[PDB]
From a paper:
As we observed unbound ring-shaped Elp456 particles in one of our datasets, we also determined the cryo-EM structure of free full-length ScElp456 at 3.7 Å overall resolution. The newly obtained structures of full-length Elp456 are almost identical to the truncated crystal structure of the Elp456 subcomplex. The structure confirms that Elp456 contains two copies of Elp4, Elp5 and Elp6, forming a symmetric dimer of trimers. However, the N- and C-terminal extensions of Elp4 and Elp5 (including a small predicted domain at the C-terminus of Elp5 (85)) remain flexible also in the fully assembled complex.
Author numbering:
A (entry chain D): 66 to 171, 233 to 419
B (entry chain E): 6 to 233
C (entry chain F): 3 to 273
D (entry chain B): 6 to 232
E (entry chain C): 1 to 273
F (entry chain A): 66 to 169, 233 to 416
The structure:
């Protein structure tokens, strides 16, 4: 049975013709090739230098899910049935209150909205809409809670967001042991595969302190990976030399694609290095085709 | 903004960066930098209290107000002592405190994050020194084939707010390479620990990429200049 | 343009000759290693299709006559990274009957029902029993494919390569005719870093398996600049152990094929 | 003197060296050398019984006389079982024995000497091989700095009477450095593990320095030429 | 260039081998670091330091200007070592007519293992060693230098000992109850040919690094890196330590220099280039 | 405390006027510089190869002491005396039966030996004793101290043959603490009764890690290094001395640490200057 086809936030893919959902950023979906994340998969957005661009993506995911549930609650003059419930594995309780608000400034619609960083989403999400799971509890207990929460919401779209995976201030050294982290990721992958008709997964990690073995293990475990690299000194200085006349035409760094969705699962080599750029604007975060000046 | 101004501001501790790291080798120690720090703090007139932690120090410094011999005394009571000597949990009109630790090489890796979280507070800032040449012990107990936890240096470099690297400047006829070999085989040459040394400064910007610079510092004239 | 070619493994021009099954007490191993960007779905599918239908019709564009097969011939597939449905969906595009292949699930509920509150010996014995029960009922013609077993080393703590070989791999190989190992060689390909001694318990398994093998297949991307005309390059080379056959003249032929993947189609050609 | 005669004599088990060590890698295994050994021994009436110990292989060789699966039983049972298949301290001069170990990379280091202190006998010749790439297991010995025991390879080389090293002869258009860097990336080229290969032989004597000789062996025609 | 004339020994700015200012104050502990190889034992260094502290001035190597004592006749020295015995020090000192009441010797070699190490834990043995040392200092008041030679051997004696443990319970507690301390150690571990022991035996080198860091002056004796004739024995280098001098005179400083010494039968010289 | 004043085996050193004892080979006593090894000291001899040459040196060392003991004829109450008791720290008790016999200013201080001959009569338990190296260090130290205390004024000769052999020493003793403590205790004992006890030992370095090597080298008083030649050197020497079958040197001798000369602050290194040869009647060392 899965998710009811009356749901608004899910659209069949062009190629696979399978259920797909957007991430809240149109450029991110466009890069993925499916213009969305097909249900039953995952994605990893690793980061270089201490910079913290990924929190924007995590908040965009959570806000898109919350907004879908909110329009479902509204259901203006019809029965839209855009139900969505979001589960976040973290301990930053303020995260729920940091979701950006909608953008109200000056084909298939209602799929992906437009968000504003400066604004704030209101009212605050209710407890039934959003739950948090402590990342310090034992692996078995966490898996049990995730399974129960999945079971309780029988007919709701589920997004599992793991913000800032493997942060030293966020996890004890015991959790850094290979067995614990790898087993947790394996269990999460199993749970995603089981209810493949309703659940999607998103996560991010900073690779500055991660040993290469754990990095390759995580890359193998997930379904897709995107690498973000900020620019260097001479790059930024030379760009500002000839682009400071237009202060709205300077990016922040490059985007690298290593593992794609099912495209690469069947045996396609699609690794593109240094051919895309990302720019974080005052209200929006965009991705465009990189071009060397 | 001229980098000299930023260096003077951070040296005066007018900035609100909570954690500061200093890395040194045997070619150039660090206590001169602490002398510069306290001289700058007194010059500004903001005589913040200073707390010293004793690990590899026997002679009590002049400027320090509280002395803590943590060598013979365990970690939990050490944290209790630091907390007790620290100001209140919350006081809007409380004077800022200064915490100096001689060496960070005596704390096990599985405690650094907890210790840093517990000692941290908006009232006080901590400066610390880590010895690059000293290598910790990893054969005391061996967990599963690899524990995957990062080393000490990488951990502090990740969790710090400003990175200070101290290097020696050679005035003789010896190249850097031969100096390094002599130090490695422990045949100490002449012309080390001079009063004029080189500094590498790294500041973590609030939003995104950090900024790094190089400088030449003399401890007699207290005149910091920028090397191109 | 280039000329289409046909896959070949051994001197008798047969990819998976059937006499391996008629001979009694002669166990053999295959080692398929690949990188993370060259996923071997087509290789496994073509191998199963050759075993059951008697020819790799997917790749050789039906350029050869059919070889007798499909008489009760069976296959067993287990994996630690894809559970049950991925194999079923991949297979149900070549009309393979559902009564000839059996898929074991080692992805769903594995950690909860296997690892927590169980010692390592119990884990290995139970997995071996699960494999044995499946292999028992089809003893005549059954190749056993297993993909990424070394992942176990991560889930179990205190588990060593020698222990894994002693308690899991060798007993399984002793009760099988053709055992095929699918592995990922990401470990050896970390740029500007060495893991020779920094991570050795993982490479030990790969080296030991290659030693105990008789034929090796390598899936790699292009070392030179990118060429959209081809995906990677498949190398077929001699293994490390003699073939447990009776035809003394049967020898493996080493070669390479430039292979390009498309919308569910692989093109093979030298260059 | 002709080293070929010495090589033929040592291969034919004419000597009295009670331990033979082979060195291998993933480029060239060492079972071909074992086949050469048994062929030479059989071709000159030295049809000694052969005892095989299994750690890796599961297909029993035809020439093998006793097959024991050591992958399961522990040390004391294994050594007792091996001893029960040997003469007991009063070996008759009727015939010799030849115990073969498929791989030594699996016995804990500390027991090696004790193992060699038991199975050794005047009527035996332990022929064993060591994989140069398979690094030892650190779970056995405590990694503390107090432990100053030498590594497995050096201990075995010091305690062995004759050392045999196997190397692969290159034929294609590649070089040794290219082959090594390809192997480190696990991109196996073609032409490796062929039938013609180099050799290194070290013989040690109780009256002078050991000696080294390098041969080229063709496993098909049984030709041993001098490099 | 090529001065065969022997030169006197000078360490600090005031042209004195060992000033007395390190004694007429409280809380002014200091540490000398002497490093030698197995080729060049620093016997004459120890003898010269002891005679300078007790008699009043170096004589074996200097011009013998014949100055008076820096302090009272009570001026005392304490010598202990984990590598040598009592008679060694006694015979070495009696060659210079050193009074028997002006020095004391602690024996850390005779029956050490059979009566100290066996059937005892680490804390107990470290405490006993510290108590035995502290007894000598509590015997007599200040102007009592303490010399300990090769203390790092405990790392190879006690099972599972660490540099951090040794410094935090033996070296620093003893330095806190002393005025001037001297650490004499062998640095052959750094000169093993073509073998970077820093990555393997890092625990040993950690002790040397930490001791040098806490030092205020370093004296190193080394054989000539480039081989020459029998006209010289070795080279002595004087370098500033890694810690400031605990002194009130802000004008004081340590002079950095190098000398070459040649040693013949029970007598060594000291000259410039 | 003390020994016989007119002991036939003890003579004052030339360069130090100290009691001295010969090691069995006059060449070693010459290379030492003190006309023998002075009492209260020790010597360590290495060999960087798989062969064995130090064994005959230890055999000579024990044989000289047993011969000095052997001057006890039934015409006893001689003015001379050579009271000597030998302690060997090993397990191969057959070594005692392999001691070479006699070949045929101060007199009888040093004897010449022949390797081929044996020593009839064989030594008895009351003179040569054995201690098993497979016991806890405390037990070994207790046994050695008991033996030393029991003998009143007999000159004790202590020799350790084939130190650190894997087939001879269990891996447990390979821990740094155990072996280093054993050497430290033996040094303490030999420095306690410095007027009588002498210590000798030999080792092979091809299986010893450099750290343990430098520690053991530091623990001893004098180190001698033996290095045989390679194939090319052997062939060149054979070609040169084709007509001289007595001038083929097996290897070099390296001097790194000496007796008291070194400990008082002298330079005594000499690399590639002396060549040795295992002659049928003498371990002959000469200029290279």
């Amino acid at each position: 049975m899965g998710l009811d086809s009356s749901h608004v936030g899910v659209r069949p893919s062009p190629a696979t013709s399978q259920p797909t959902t957007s991430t809240g950023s149109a450029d991110l979906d466009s890069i993925l090739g499916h213009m969305g994340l097909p249900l039953g998969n995952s994605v990893l957005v690793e980061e270089q230098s201490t910079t913290e661009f990924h929190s924007i993506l995590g908040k965009l995911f959570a806000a898109q899910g919350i907004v879908h549930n909110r329009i479902s609650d509204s259901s203006a003059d019809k029965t839209r049935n855009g139900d969505t419930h979001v589960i976040v594995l973290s301990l930053n309780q303020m995260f729920a209150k940091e979701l950006p608000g909608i953008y109200k400034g000056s084909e298939y619609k209602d799929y992906n909205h437009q968000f504003d960083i400066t604004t704030r989403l209101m009212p605050a999400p209710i407890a039934s809409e959003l739950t948090f799971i402590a990342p310090t509890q034992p692996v078995s207990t966490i898996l049990s809670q995730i399974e129960q929460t999945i079971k309780r919401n029988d007919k709701k779209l589920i997004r599992i967001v793991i913000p800032s995976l493997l942060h030293p201030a966020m996890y004890p050294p015991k959790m850094f042991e290979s067995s614990e982290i790898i087993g947790l990721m394996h269990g999460v992958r199993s749970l995603v595969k089981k209810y493949y008709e309703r659940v999607v997964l998103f996560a991010s990690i900073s690779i500055d302190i991660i040993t290469p073995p754990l990095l390759v293990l995580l890359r193998n475990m997930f379904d897709s990976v995107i690498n973000l690299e900020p620019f260097n000194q001479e790059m930024t200085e030379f760009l500002e030399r000839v682009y400071k006349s237009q202060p709205g035409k300077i990016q922040h760094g490059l985007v690298h694609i290593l593992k794609l969705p099912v495209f690469t699962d069947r045996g396609e080599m699609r690794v593109l290095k240094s051919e895309w750029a990302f720019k974080n604007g005052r209200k929006k975060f965009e991705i465009e085709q990189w071009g060397i000046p | 903004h001229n980098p000299v101004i930023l260096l003077k501001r951070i040296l005066s501790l007018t900035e609100s960066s909570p954690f500061i790291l200093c890395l040194d080798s045997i070619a150039q120690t660090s206590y001169k930098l602490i002398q510069e720090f306290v001289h700058q703090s007194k010059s500004k007139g903001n005589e913040y209290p200073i707390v010293y932690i004793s690990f590899e120090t026997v002679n009590k410094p002049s400027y320090c107000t509280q002395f803590i011999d943590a060598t013979q005394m365990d970690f939990v009571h050490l944290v209790k002592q630091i907390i007790s000597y620290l100001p209140a949990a919350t006081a809007t009109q409380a004077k800022k405190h200064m915490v100096i630790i001689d060496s960070l090489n005596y704390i096990s890796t599985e405690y650094i994050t907890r210790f840093l979280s517990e000692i941290a507070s908006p009232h006080c800032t901590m400066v610390a020194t880590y010895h690059k040449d000293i290598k910790d012990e990893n054969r005391t107990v061996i967990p599963d084939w690899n524990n995957n936890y990062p080393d000490k240096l990488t951990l502090l470099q990740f969790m710090a707010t400003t990175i200070v690297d101290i290097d020696v400047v050679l005035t003789g006829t010896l190249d850097t390479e031969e100096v390094s070999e002599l130090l490695n085989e422990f045949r100490i040459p002449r012309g080390l620990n001079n009063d004029i040394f080189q500094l590498r400064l790294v500041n973590k910007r609030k939003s995104g990429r950090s900024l790094e610079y190089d400088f030449i510092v003399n401890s007699n004239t207290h005149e910091y200049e920028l090397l191109s | 343009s280039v000329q289409r070619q046909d896959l070949v493994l051994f001197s008798d021009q047969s990819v998976l000759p059937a006499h391996f099954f008629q001979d009694s007490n002669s166990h053999n191993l295959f080692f398929i290693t690949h990188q993370s960007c060259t996923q071997p779905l087509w290789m496994i599918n073509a191998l199963v299709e050759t075993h059951v239908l008697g020819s790799p019709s997917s790749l050789n564009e039906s350029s050869s006559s059919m070889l007798p097969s499909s008489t009760r011939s069976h296959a067993v597939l287990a994996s630690f990274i894809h559970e049950q449905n991925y194999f079923t969906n991949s297979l149900n595009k070549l009309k393979i009957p559902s009564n000839n292949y059996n898929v074991l699930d080692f992805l769903s509920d594995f950690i909860v029902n296997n690892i927590h509150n169980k010692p390592r010996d119990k884990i290995l014995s139970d997995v071996l029993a699960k494999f044995s029960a499946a292999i028992q009922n089809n003893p005549t013609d059954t190749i056993v494919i297993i993909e990424q077993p070394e992942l176990l080393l991560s889930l179990v703590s205190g588990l060593t390569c020698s222990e894994l070989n002693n308690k899991f791999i060798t007993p399984l190989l002793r009760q099988c005719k053709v055992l095929i190992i699918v592995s990922n060689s990401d470990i050896f390909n970390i740029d500007e870093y060495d893991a020779s001694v920094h991570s050795s318990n993982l490479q030990n398994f790969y080296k030991s398996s290659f030693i105990k093998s008789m034929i090796n297949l390598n899936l790699n991307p292009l070392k030179t600049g990118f060429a959209k005309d081809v995906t990677g390059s498949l190398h077929v080379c001699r293994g490390g152990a003699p073939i447990a056959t009776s035809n003394t003249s049967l020898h493996v032929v080493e070669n390479e094929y430039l292979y390009l993947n498309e919308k569910e189609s692989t093109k093979l050609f030298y260059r």
